[PDB]
Design a protein around this nucleic acid. Sequence first.
DNA 1: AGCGTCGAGATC
DNA 2: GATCTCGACGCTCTCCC
Length: 629
Amino acid sequence: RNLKHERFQSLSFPHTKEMMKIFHKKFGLHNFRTNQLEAINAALLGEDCFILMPTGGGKSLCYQLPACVSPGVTVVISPLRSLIVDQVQKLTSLDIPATYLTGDKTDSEATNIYLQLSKKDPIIKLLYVTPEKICASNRLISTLENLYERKLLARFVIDEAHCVSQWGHDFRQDYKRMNMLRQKFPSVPVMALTATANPRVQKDILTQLKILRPQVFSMSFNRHNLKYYVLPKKPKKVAFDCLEWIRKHHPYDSGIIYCLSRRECDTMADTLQRDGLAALAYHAGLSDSARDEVQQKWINQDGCQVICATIAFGMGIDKPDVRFVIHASLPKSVEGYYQESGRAGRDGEISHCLLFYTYHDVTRLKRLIMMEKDGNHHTRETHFNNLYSMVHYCENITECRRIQLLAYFGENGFNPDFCKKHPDVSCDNCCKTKDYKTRDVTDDVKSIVRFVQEHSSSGRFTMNMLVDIFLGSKSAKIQSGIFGKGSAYSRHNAERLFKKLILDKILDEDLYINANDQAIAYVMLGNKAQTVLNGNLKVDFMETEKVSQREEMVKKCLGELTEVCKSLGKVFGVHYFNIFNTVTLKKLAESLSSDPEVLLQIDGVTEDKLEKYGAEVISVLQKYSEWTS
DNA sequence: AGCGTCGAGATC
DNA sequence: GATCTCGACGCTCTCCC
Ligand SMILES: Nc1ncnc2c1ncn2[C@@H]1O[C@H](COP(=O)(O)OP(=O)(O)O)[C@@H](O)[C@H]1O
Ligand SMILES: [Zn+2]
């Protein structure tokens, strides 16, 4: 399914002259990434395009570049004004005419937009818009209708297209009403983009939007620049480990910490602030005035380094230079973990994804499923399925996590040499230095299964009890059926081995509620236990035991350049990263050159940007002129 | 009633 | 010095918009 659009890879096309002209001089880029040239060409031939790329893939270019090289205006549908504002700010920073009708623009300002569009001489190529605006306001419609007639409606871009699927992680009703846009404007090319790896959703997007035979541009959803860590969660020193970790690796960079509840966010946020870390809580419990102040401070890096957010609310804001993302608890599913931690490092620079794990968090999350009241169906059983798939990600400490994540989406092709060919972004499992031998413990398992069967006739021994008992400890509750046999086993391997008999469907768990809300998991038996007792299924387990002077100047240079962007930001009324992105800055500093003939040969440096932001930047770069050796 | 935490003492 | 064990003591949160 990962096709090759050999037809669209040619530079022989008529538009190719002007397109490359805008690609080099307006955007300032030099080389296309995977499926970029193919997707761009296709869009410019009037084809219905469907873009599937992971975060940071390069989805923005697939519609932003065609709009610049097209008669008329491209109409882009986005789900949030926050996303819209960020993209328009990036575009206006390149002197590319664009604006938006989100709804919080007063009718007077709104009308000024409709004016520039009506002249039929519009200089504006990109018009971002929210879905309820199209649905509710028939004022917008009467404008578009005029553009269609003069053949100036270039195409309908549908950003975040996964919002149309009820099977998607972010469903929106107004996206269902997008089919009415194609009905009135059938001649107009439609383009859908998404960063969803879930194929069942990818398929559903096409079915719901009723796009007739599109060009499907797929890609490997492996996140090339994310370091995946799983770490042992000693509860109650999460904040300390986060504080310690952040200060060690990324003391002066923004990040996110995801917590299950609004309260735990406040708690996490509180602990960090009083120790001198710029942390704020972020969730739906905040007043609207508060919410706006948080995102002001976090996005612009003005008095807030870290937000402590609930998953639902954390999706609502973003910045491209998020250097780390920490999950304080255990995510509900692997797709969820992937999309959540995936939003780190959109700017393509290395970023870290830390999951704090303990199996205790499982029983908590297990009870949440039982409680909630939309209806206890055998679909909510699947919420349990996803959960088990998540634990597997955490318990698997040998197989490359990149393979594990992609395997969950069923991605085929990925080379397991990646972490080895790319040491700088290796995951923890491939980071783990030593080897381990797998042994057969069927003998040991039989005794165990027998033990549980005897005292169950729900359950009467939790995992901890069972481990203490089988470890031959002195905290053990009963020294009868298997006391002292896992004497060989450490309390690390004894633990994991017990975590692996609840993952092979060998021992299920009991969810008794307590004399209080925190539920306990008594151990029972798992269906497959007899296929083991039959003399059939075999079991296996795997016991687990200076800077140089020029390099010093680029650091100093890069330091000043960042603040200059921050200042230019407040002046031009724009986020600091919509001036120069992190990669642009990093390459500028490493040249130490003031020669514009060398600077324009760097990604992100354009004639316009080096003209209205140049003077301030070149001044700083002049100081290091005597170092460009 | 289970469960981390954590100081004191065993063990390497 | 660093990791383990024991066992007394203290806290346990139907989540998210
Ligand atoms: N082909 C490319 N060449 C150079 N830089 C690129 C390219 N594509 C994207 N980028 C850079 O990557 C950053 C984010 O890419 P973006 O298109 O926003 O990814 P996505 O839209 O998938 O989130 C942008 O700041 C842009 O400068
Ligand atoms: Zn790996």
